[PDB]
A paper describes a structure:
In the kidney collecting duct, arginine vasopressin-dependent trafficking of aquaporin-2 (AQP2) fine-tunes reabsorption of water from pre-urine, allowing precise regulation of the final urine volume. Point mutations in the gene for AQP2 may disturb this process and lead to nephrogenic diabetes insipidus (NDI), whereby patients void large volumes of highly hypo-osmotic urine.
In contrast to T125M, T126M can be glycosylated and is therefore able to enter the glycosylation-dependent quality control pathway. Hence, it seems plausible that T126M would be a better substrate for UGT than wild-type AQP2, despite being able to adopt the overall native fold. Overall, T126M gave crystals which diffracted to highest resolution, (~3–3.3 Å), followed by T125M (~3.7–4 Å). Density for the methionine side chain could be observed in all monomers for T126M however this was not the case for T125M due to the lower resolution.
Numbering used by the authors:
A (entry chain B): 6 to 238
B (entry chain C): 6 to 241
C (entry chain D): 2 to 233
D (entry chain A): 2 to 240
C-alpha cells in the first residue's frame, strides 16, 4: 500500500516536471523563437529523463493514454490506472500553473495550448493524433516488454526519441499532443479549449490501437487455460 | 505459420508509420520551414523507433534495399525477402496516401518526393545514394552481428542515427532516398517520377556493396557445417 | 591503504579536469559568434553532450559530478564523507575558473563579450528565476541518482547519455530565464574572469536547493533504503 | 607475423574505407550552401553521427580510429604495434583524400567552393587556434579510451554514440575557431584536393598533441591498468 502511494506520487511529480519543462520550452520567446526540432527535443528529452529517473518506481507513464494502453496490456489494476490518470492530470495542471507563475506575462501568451495548426481539419487532426500515439505506444511496449529481457538496450532514450519523433510531425497539425494531460494543463490555466476533443480521442484511440496491435496481433502471448475449452469442444 | 504472417505485417506497419512520419515532417512548411537537421532527425528517429518497436517481430527492415542486402547474410530466404519487399512497398504508399488525406491541400505540395536538387546530375546523384545506403547497410550488419562484441540486443538508435547521417548529406542532392519504397510512395500518390531510377539503382547497389564488403571482405561470418557444405559440394 | 589513496587523488584530479573541459566547451559554444549565432538547441546540445561525454570519459574514476550541487546531493543522498565532497567542490570551482580563463585567452578579444555569464533574461525576476533553477537541478539529480543507484547495478543502462540529455533538457527551458546554470561552478567561472555578478546568488541558491530537494525526494520519498528485513 | 595475417589486412582496409566515408559525408554535409546553409549544430551532427556510425559499423574489425591522432593515442596506450600504427595512419590519409576527391566529383562546381577546408576563423590566431585543437582532441581521446574500456559496462550502441557525440561536442566549439579538425586526415584531404594549405600545421600539431596528452592522462594518471594479480583483490580490503 505504501509502494502504491510512491508510484502515484511519482506519476504526479513526473507529469508535473514534464508539463513544466515542455510548455515552458514551447512558449513564444521573442529574441530567440524556438524551432520545431527544439520543441521536439524538449518534450523528447523530458520523457526520456523522467523514464530514467522514475521508471523503476512507477513505470513512468506521464501520459493518460499510456496508462489506458497499459490497462489493456500490462498487469495494472483498474484501481491503479485510475490513480495514475488522476495523478497525471493533477501533476500536469500543477506544472502549468507553476510555469505560469514563474513565466513573465509578456511571454506566456497561449501557454503552448494545443490548437489545430496549419488549417488542419478536426477529422484530419484526430487521425494524426491517432498515429502519433500509436507509434509511441508500440515503442513503449517494446521497450518495456519483460519478454524481451535486457535486449531493448535504451528504453528511456528510445521512448524519449519516440515522443520527439511525434513532435517532429505533430507540431504542424495540432502542436503535438500524444498526452491528454499535456493538453488539459494549459487549457485549464489559460482559457483555451479549441477543439479539445481531438487531443483526447486521438491519443486514446491511438493508444488502445497500439496496445491491441502489439499484445494480440504483433506479439501475442501463448494460449492460456482457454485451450482446455477447444479440447472439450 | 503465424510467426511469418506477424513479421510481414510488421514490415508493412513499420513502413507505413515510417513514410507517414517521414514525408510529413518534410512537408508542413508554413512560417516554420523544416531544416536539414530537422528532417534528418525525423527520418532518423523514425527508423530507430520502428526498429525498437518491431525489430524483435520482423527484423525491422523498412527498406527494400536493406531487405535485398539481408538476402546475403541475414538468413532471410528469397521467399521472405519478396514478402518483405512487397509489404514495404504497400505500407509506404499507404502511409503517403494517409498523409495526403490528413494534410490540408495547400501544404501537401510535392509530398516530399525525392527529386534532383541543387542542379545535381543523375549520375552524380546515383553516386550519393549508393554511399548513403552503403554506410547504412554497413551499420546494420554490425549492429545485428553476434560477434560485434557486446551484450545481446540490437542498437536501434545507432541504426536510426545512421539513417539521419545519410540525410545530412543526401538531402542536398536528392532529398535523400536510401530506401526505394520511400521514393515510390510519394511518387505514386502525387505522380512525380522525375529521375525515379536514381532512387532505386542507388539504394539497391549501395546495399549489395555493403553486404558483399562486410560478409566477404571486412568481417566474414562463421559458417555452420551445413552452410560450409553448400559451398564445397557446390564446387566440382 | 596506498591503493586507496591514489584512487582518491585520481578522483579529485578527474573532477578538476572535468569541470575545466565542461566550462571551456560550454561557454565557448554559447558565445555570440556573429557568423553563426548559437540557437537554444545548439547551446543545449553543447552543454548536454559535454556532460555526457565527460560522464562517459571520467565517470568510472570520480563519479563525474562536474557540479557542486550534485556533490552536495551525494552528501545528503549517496552518503559520502564530507572530506571527499569538500575536495570535489574545490576542484570544480578551480577547474571552472581555469576553463573560463583558458577560453578567454583562446578566443579573440572582440568576440569574448559577456563570456556566457549567467544573467537574468527576458525581464525575469530573481524570485521567478530562483524557482526555475530549482526545478532544473531537481530533475537532473533525479536522473543522476537513478542512473547511478547502487540497486540498479545489473544492467549498465545509459547513465552518460541520460544525464547528458537531462542537462540538455534543462537548457531547452533554462536558457530563456537565466541562460541555464544548474551548476554554481559554471556560473562562478565566467563571473570571476569577466566581472559580472548581477544576481549571482540566484545561480547559487537555486541549484543547491533543487539538488538537496531532489536528493531528499529520492532517498526518503521515492526510493528509500529498506528499513528492516522485510525486503532488505 | 602481424603483417601477413588477414585480420591485419581487414583492419587496414576498414581504416581506409571508414576514413573514406567519414570525409565524404562530413565535408559534403558541411559544404552544400546554395539555398540551405548548414548550421553549426547541423555540421556538428554530421561529423558526430559520422564517427558514431562508423565506430558502430567497423569498430569490431579495426578499432575505428578514423584519425591519425587517435591511432597515435593508442600507440601510446592500446596495444597497437608501431607497424600497425603506421599502416593505420597511411590507410586513413589515403582514404581521406579518396573521400574528398570522390565528393568533389559528385558535388556541382557552383557549390564546391573551398571544399570545407579547415581554416582559421573569426580572426583567431594560430597560437590560439592550435590551443583549441589540443583540447578538442583531448576530450575525444578521453571519451574514446573510456568508451572502449573493458572495465566499463555499457549497453550495445551507446559507446559508439558517446564517441560520436564527443566529436559533435568538439564541432559545437571548434567550428568557430578552425572549422573543427580533431583529425589530421580530415584536414589534409580537402587541402590536397582544393590546394589550400593556410596554417596547415595547426590542424596537425593540435590534434596529435591533444591525443597523446589524452592517452597519457587516461592510461597513467586517471585510470591506469592494474599491476599485480592481487591489486583488485586488495582494493576490497576490510569491510
Amino acid at each position: 500500500s505504501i509502494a502504491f502511494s510512491r508510484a502515484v506520487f511519482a506519476e504526479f511529480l513526473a507529469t508535473l516536471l514534464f508539463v513544466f519543462f515542455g510548455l515552458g520550452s514551447a512558449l513564444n520567446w521573442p529574441q530567440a523563437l524556438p524551432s520545431v526540432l527544439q520543441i521536439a527535443m524538449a518534450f523528447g528529452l523530458g520523457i526520456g529523463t523522467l523514464v530514467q529517473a522514475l521508471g523503476h518506481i512507477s513505470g513512468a507513464h506521464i501520459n493518460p493514454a499510456v496508462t489506458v494502453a497499459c490497462l489493456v496490456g500490462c498487469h495494472v489494476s483498474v484501481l491503479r490506472a485510475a490513480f495514475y490518470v488522476a495523478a497525471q492530470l493533477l501533476g500536469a495542471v500543477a506544472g502549468a500553473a507553476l510555469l505560469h507563475e514563474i513565466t513573465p506575462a509578456d511571454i506566456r501568451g497561449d501557454l503552448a495550448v494545443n490548437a489545430l495548426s496549419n488549417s488542419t481539419m478536426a477529422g484530419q487532426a484526430v487521425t494524426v493524433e491517432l498515429f502519433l500515439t500509436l507509434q509511441l505506444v508500440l515503442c513503449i511496449f517494446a521497450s518495456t516488454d519483460e519478454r524481451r529481457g535486457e535486449n531493448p538496450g535504451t528504453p528511456a532514450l528510445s521512448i524519449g526519441f519516440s515522443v520527439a519523433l511525434g513532435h517532429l510531425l505533430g507540431i504542424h497539425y495540432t502542436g503535438c499532443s500524444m498526452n491528454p494531460a499535456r493538453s488539459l494543463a494549459p487549457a485549464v490555466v489559460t482559457g483555451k479549449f479549441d477543439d479539445h476533443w481531438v487531443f483526447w480521442i486521438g491519443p486514446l484511440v491511438g493508444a488502445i490501437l497500439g496496445s491491441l496491435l502489439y499484445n494480440y496481433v504483433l506479439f501475442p502471448p501463448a494460449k492460456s487455460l482457454s485451450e482446455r475449452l477447444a479440447v472439450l469442444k
